[PDB]
Design a protein around this ligand. Structure first.
Ligand SMILES: CC(C)(COP(=O)(O)OP(=O)(O)OC[C@H]1O[C@@H](n2cnc3c(N)ncnc32)[C@H](O)[C@@H]1OP(=O)(O)O)[C@@H](O)C(=O)NCCC(=O)NCCS
Ligand SMILES: CC(C)(COP(=O)(O)OP(=O)(O)OC[C@H]1O[C@@H](n2cnc3c(N)ncnc32)[C@H](O)[C@@H]1OP(=O)(O)O)[C@@H](O)C(=O)NCCC(=O)NCCS
Lengths: 383, 383
């Protein structure tokens, strides 16, 4: 049985979003108008302060006002609407995922018949056959591509798809793994109630997007393959004292979510143990001596991690950039951060794809409370 | 990192079912009585013929008549009932899965802290955090167990979990993978309509169960590990001219399924291609010279494959026995077949765990139409 030699690497990254944009300056007034909730004057001003403090300036969003006029049940606080949401999302999720995959394939530059495996994750929908089947068909992949469908992971799933891809690519000589994440927030959009600030936090922060990577071991430079990041080691853990703090449920009313106020403190108070476990085998203890690829679940998670570890403000630039332009897109977000990091490193004349550092860490955070961790190495930029 | 040498093997198998039983000879009268549909006299007689031809003698079934009396919306033909089904199934799916896992761990005989990974599949429910999280908590696994949650695969998923486990176990020295499938048909139970035989076929065939395996490379005989089957090679394919023939959708009314009359012919007309691809590299062309571990999706699938390939009656003994005593339990069913094969081989004095044969094939069939294939080797039974 022929296995590969040496580590799996990310060979290409592609991203996509719906064309329609929500400008955050306009969002409190838009949301309270389309939901027929203008009478809630005090709640609207509380919501404006949440949106202003979020550090999100714009979001892409497939759902538009004409969808809401065609089905006004979607603007109610709680109404049976899953079937309408699914009718949209079982089509749009694989379509936007295929758009990200086509951009990754173009960068990679190899024939699409060389793709041996396809991993697909989304928390926005579920169906049989799944988004993996439709994405493969829209791309014209081999019917014998080996698929890994992972519905309903949530915000840690960008780390999960890299962890799954690493073992496949290393155990199978010649394997080339296409891994894609895609979410569309029409699954969870609904109108306000007078007391429910938890619902409003989600309505302010979640946005739409897809991101795809090609992963393989033994890159062949002679045909034009080029590694961007090496995948070194992985971990997945459940934080102590964290039950129920991040949740998401598929219900008759749509996707219903739970977000506890303690989430930023729980991440920040546990993240040093994750780093010690990952980096002691490599001989590293200085968290300012590595690059970071961090899921921006909210501005408070980034601010509290930076403060707890005394990180320099260089580490989170790409996480803050993606947050500002796209909001929280669930699993795909950390892959947008990876793309921005390597692109900015080249634009700024840095020595490696990881802002001039050799070693780095990737983190995703989501339901459990689960932390996905990947130790990564950059590649030199040769000029 | 340190990778393992040699092939991954199944080291232990455990199974579980709800205690409540449906006798098939009584099911036409039970179903039409509890769904308040006795006025459909001609439909009930057609259903009696379907149940008599199904070659299912009994099924285990968590849903009972007292559940139906407490919530009569569950016996309507089509009614908004997903929330009530999920409220039951988010609890009962990880519970029944844990029961199968505990039996596999007892056979294996090693500390549960040696489990490094947990794979979970179910088509009956979906939630965040998932059934994998709850099953790991109920078992008391390490919080750092690496989880692989796969919701909504369907009837091919017993093959899928083996395919995922193989690459994890081979690429990581010391890895021990717990892989579990679990389905509970309360997700799809509903009352009849005057015309709809497709719905009734599913009401006659689907039953409840869970099955778990432990998979690892480099078994250690000195501490009591013993391989049962070696996992040699894997494939996943989509059959030509099969779009739409097997489907399942999560809707306000529950799990809604599609089953086309052409399914048995499509499988039988394509299965030889699958065998030639799997076995030509090994030098094998005689399909009666290997053992078979086949998902019994319905009696007609088995009948048409046997006829097409001129298989001897020995090949489908265990598939037919599991169908008789349990019905179609979705992804877990093929792992019940694997357990029965190795237990019967010991009881009947055969020389290997695969009915005296060296080489074998495992098949799962489900939405796509997708076929999962695994080439396996038996191990000797020696004294
Ligand atoms: C939402 C956020 C951007 C607001 O920033 P901020 O205004 O500087 O922070 P504050 O803590 O002052 O929150 C503003 C208001 O929102 C409320 N709020 C914030 N998070 C909340 C939650 N999870 N549930 C309920 N209310 C919440 C606060 O109680 C406060 O209201 P009050 O002043 O009436 O008490 C910030 O709290 C954040 O980034 N949170 C993390 C979001 C998260 O968990 N993301 C993961 C998604 S899976
Ligand atoms: C259901 C089954 C056990 C019935 O066996 P049988 O009675 O010997 O087979 P028949 O083909 O004569 O079918 C009996 C009746 O069921 C009907 N029927 C069978 N499969 C059907 C389907 N998929 N949709 C609608 N009606 C169906 C037949 O049309 C026939 O009714 P009719 O005489 O009024 O036309 C058999 O057809 C079977 O095993 N089918 C495969 C099930 C399957 O696809 N499983 C995969 C699950 S994902």
């Amino acid at each position: 049985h022929l296995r590969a030699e040496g580590p799996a690497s990310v060979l290409a990254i592609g991203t996509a979003n719906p064309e329609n944009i929500l400008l955050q300056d306009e969002f409190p007034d838009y949301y309270f108008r389309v939901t027929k909730s203008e009478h809630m004057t005090q709640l609207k001003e509380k919501f404006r302060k949440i949106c202003d403090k979020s550090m999100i300036r714009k979001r892409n969003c497939f759902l538009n006002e004409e969808h809401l006029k065609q089905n006004p049940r979607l603007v109610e606080h709680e109404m049976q609407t899953l079937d309408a949401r699914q009718d949209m999302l079982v089509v749009e999720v694989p379509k936007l995922g295929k758009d990200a995959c086509a951009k990754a394939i173009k960068e990679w530059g190899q024939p699409k018949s060389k793709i041996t495996h396809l991993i697909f994750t989304s928390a926005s929908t579920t169906d049989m056959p799944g988004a993996d089947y439709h994405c493969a068909k829209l791309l014209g992949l081999s019917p014998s591509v080996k698929r890994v469908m992972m519905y309903q992971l949530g915000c840690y799933g960008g780390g999960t798809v890299l962890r799954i891809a690493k073992d496949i690519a290393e155990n199978n000589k010649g394997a080339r793994v296409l891994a894609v994440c895609c979410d569309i927030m029409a699954c969870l959009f609904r109108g306000p109630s007078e007391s429910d600030l938890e619902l409003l936090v989600g309505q302010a922060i979640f946005g739409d997007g897809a991101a795809a990577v090609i992963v393989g071991a033994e890159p062949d430079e002679s045909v034009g393959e080029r590694p961007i990041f090496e995948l070194v080691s992985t971990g997945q853990t459940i934080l102590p004292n964290s039950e129920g703090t991040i949740g998401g449920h598929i219900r008759e009313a749509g996707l219903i979510f739970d977000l506890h106020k303690d989430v930023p403190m729980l991440i920040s108070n546990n993240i040093e143990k994750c780093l010690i476990e990952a980096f002691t085998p490599i001989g590293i203890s200085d968290w300012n001596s590595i690059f970071w690829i961090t899921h921006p679940g909210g501005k408070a998670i980034l601010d509290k991690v930076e403060e707890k570890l005394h990180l320099k403000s260089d580490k989170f630039v790409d996480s803050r950039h993606v947050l500002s332009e796209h909001g929280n897109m669930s699993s795909s977000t950390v892959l947008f951060v990876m793309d921005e990091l390597r692109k900015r490193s080249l634009e700024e004349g840095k020595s490696t794809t990881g802002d001039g550092f050799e070693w780095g860490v990737l983190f995703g955070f989501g339901p459990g409370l689960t932390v996905e961790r990947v130790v990564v190495r950059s590649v030199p930029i040769k000029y």
